[PDB]
């Protein structure tokens, strides 16, 4: 299939319309972040050398 | 119908005229790029 944006949607945009929440919803949303990676290090002559 | 309270949007809004469904002002940066 041929990749969708989403669902088309349409606002009744007036000239004298709005629209107002009566209501709410707490939402809680999830955010990963990665901060720091392995600490590595080397050593040539033992790496390089055997 | 596009009566925006007087504020014309024909440069940054899509125009269907054209085949490619792009802007005045995206059709003339997509030409001002040359690839
Ligand atoms: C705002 O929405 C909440 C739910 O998101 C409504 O609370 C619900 O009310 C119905 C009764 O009509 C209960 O059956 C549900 O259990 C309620 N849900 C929760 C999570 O408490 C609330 O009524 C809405 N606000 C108004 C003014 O109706
Ligand atoms: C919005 O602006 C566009 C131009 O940016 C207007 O289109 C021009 O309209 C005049 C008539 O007054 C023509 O002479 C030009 O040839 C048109 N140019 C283009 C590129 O179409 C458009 O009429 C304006 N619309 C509103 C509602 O203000
Ligand atoms: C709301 O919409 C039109 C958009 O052209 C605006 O001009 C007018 O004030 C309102 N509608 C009418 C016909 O009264």
Same mark, same amino acid.
């Given at each position: @299939?041929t990749?969708?944006?989403? +669902?088309?949607?349409? $606002? +009744? @945009?007036?000239?004298?319309?709005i +629209? %107002?929440?009566?209501?709410?919803?707490?939402?809680?949303?999830?955010? %990963?972040?990665? $901060?720091?990676?392995?600490?590595?290090? $080397?050593?040539?002559?033992? @790496? %390089?050398?055997? | 119908? &596009?009566?925006?309270?007087? =504020?014309? =949007?024909?440069?940054?809004?899509?125009?269907?005229? &054209?085949?490619?469904?792009?802007?005045?002002?995206?059709?003339?940066?997509?030409? &001002?790029?040359?690839?």
């Amino acid at each position: @299939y041929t990749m969708s944006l989403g +669902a088309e949607n349409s $606002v +009744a @945009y007036s000239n004298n319309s709005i +629209a %107002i929440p009566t209501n709410f919803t707490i939402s809680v949303t999830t955010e %990963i972040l990665p $901060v720091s990676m392995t600490k590595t290090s $080397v050593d040539c002559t033992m @790496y %390089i050398c055997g | 119908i &596009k009566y925006f309270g007087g =504020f014309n =949007f024909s440069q940054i809004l899509p125009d269907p005229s &054209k085949p490619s469904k792009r802007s005045p002002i995206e059709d003339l940066l997509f030409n &001002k790029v040359t690839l």
